[PDB]
């Protein structure tokens, strides 16, 4: 059942990244698929995960 | 619409070769703990486009110490033969029903020497002149083993009609009857396409590239296209020859799916072998076939010609 579990997690990350638009933006710009906790934000506009 | 079918044969093979240059760089890297190309588009899907554009718009240098006629003809031969050698393949309904399809394609398989020799000599470099003869000797000395293996395998099929080969297998995978033979055949295929275990022509210590040294940009990329089209073509040949599949005439798509899956699996085995094994030496390379492969192939051919007679199971001629 870990296969359907990882399928569910893969469909969960598309929700974690602010929906389809945010997910596609992250995939195309940052070459990343995973979502981490926002540990901080600098003045210039970079999110630290 | 015949020409439309032709184009539907060439063009998809061209995209297949193009994305093979991505799947190899991904498979190899993952085999050696590398993520592979995933920056050009999603999961590196767009990467083959960029390198192709670069090589098209890269400067093609004319070899000053060369006769341009062969410097241009050799890519023509290598590429055109590689694609037209896809013509008689048994897709559920093969494009051209040539009565001697297997012999047709085996004969065209020998023609790659006729690009190798002109590339190696016309470019006029030491690495080129060495690698031309070395690679020529490789491929010609393995073509014989390919020939006896093809004959011995076919002696149970019935004829040289390559469409009836499916009808030969139908029940059981043909490898189950000729696994000793296929094990040689596959390896000889690995030798004929000049792959890392058996390449011997690149040899990036003493041959560097062997034949594609002075070739640059487009004519250079054409030989890669030939090389990584022969990969798919011979893996597909082996796939049908030994790894049979079902084919219901009312549903042609089923055999198509099974066959493409077999071809992908065999190409992945190609990449699998190259990602692990060391590279042969010319001494051992020809020792492998002259001393070891050829006697076993001769004996197996004798076995596979005597077997249908004693079992009273000669295959149907028509």
């Amino acid at each position: 059942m870990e296969l359907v579990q990882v399928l569910r997690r893969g469909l969960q990350q598309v929700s974690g990244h602010g929906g389809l638009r945010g997910y596609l933006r992250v995939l195309f710009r940052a070459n990343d698929v995973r979502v981490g906790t926002l540990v901080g934000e600098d003045k210039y506009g970079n999110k630290y995960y | 619409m015949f020409m439309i079918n032709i184009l539907s044969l060439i063009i998809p093979i061209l995209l297949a070769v193009a994305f093979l240059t991505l799947v190899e760089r991904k498979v190899l890297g993952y085999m050696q703990l590398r993520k592979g190309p995933n920056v050009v588009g999603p999961y590196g899907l767009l990467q083959p486009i960029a390198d192709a554009l670069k090589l098209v718009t890269k400067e093609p240098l004319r070899p000053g110490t060369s006769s341009i006629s062969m410097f241009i003809i050799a890519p023509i031969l290598g590429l055109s033969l590689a694609l037209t050698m896809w013509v008689p393949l048994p897709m559920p309904y093969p494009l051209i029903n040539m009565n001697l399809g297997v012999l047709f394609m085996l004969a065209m398989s020998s023609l790659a020497v006729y690009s190798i020799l002109w590339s190696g000599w016309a470019s006029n470099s030491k690495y080129a002149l060495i690698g031309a003869l070395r690679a020529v000797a490789q491929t010609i000395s393995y073509e014989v083993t390919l020939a006896i293996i093809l004959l011995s395998v076919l002696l149970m099929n019935g004829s040289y009609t390559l469409s009836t080969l499916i009808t030969t297998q139908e029940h059981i995978w043909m490898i189950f009857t000729s696994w000793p033979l296929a094990m040689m055949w596959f390896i000889s295929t690995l030798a004929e396409t000049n792959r890392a275990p058996f390449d011997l022509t690149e040899g990036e210590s003493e041959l560097v590239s062997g034949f594609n040294v002075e070739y640059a940009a487009g004519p250079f990329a054409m030989f890669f296209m030939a090389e990584y089209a022969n990969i798919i073509m011979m893996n597909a040949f082996t796939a049908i020859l030994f790894l049979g599949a079902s084919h219901d005439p009312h549903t042609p798509e089923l055999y198509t799916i099974n066959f493409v899956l077999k071809t992908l699996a065999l190409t992945i085995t190609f990449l699998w072998i190259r990602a692990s094994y060391p590279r042969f030496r010319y001494d051992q390379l020809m020792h492998l076939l002259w001393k070891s492969f050829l006697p076993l192939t001769l004996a197996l051919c004798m076995w596979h010609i005597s077997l249908p007679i004693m079992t009273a199971s000669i295959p149907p001629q028509s």
Partner: protein, 45 residues
Amino acid sequence: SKVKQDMPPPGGYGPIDYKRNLPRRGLSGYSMFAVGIGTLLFGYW
């Protein structure tokens, strides 16, 4: 304060394996030849 620095734990350290533990796997040569010949024979039948 007492002097302290990067030191091994008081119980030393756990053993570090160095012997080649290359695994052994595979049927007997007779078994391999037998299974190959049996698959062959089924194929010919």
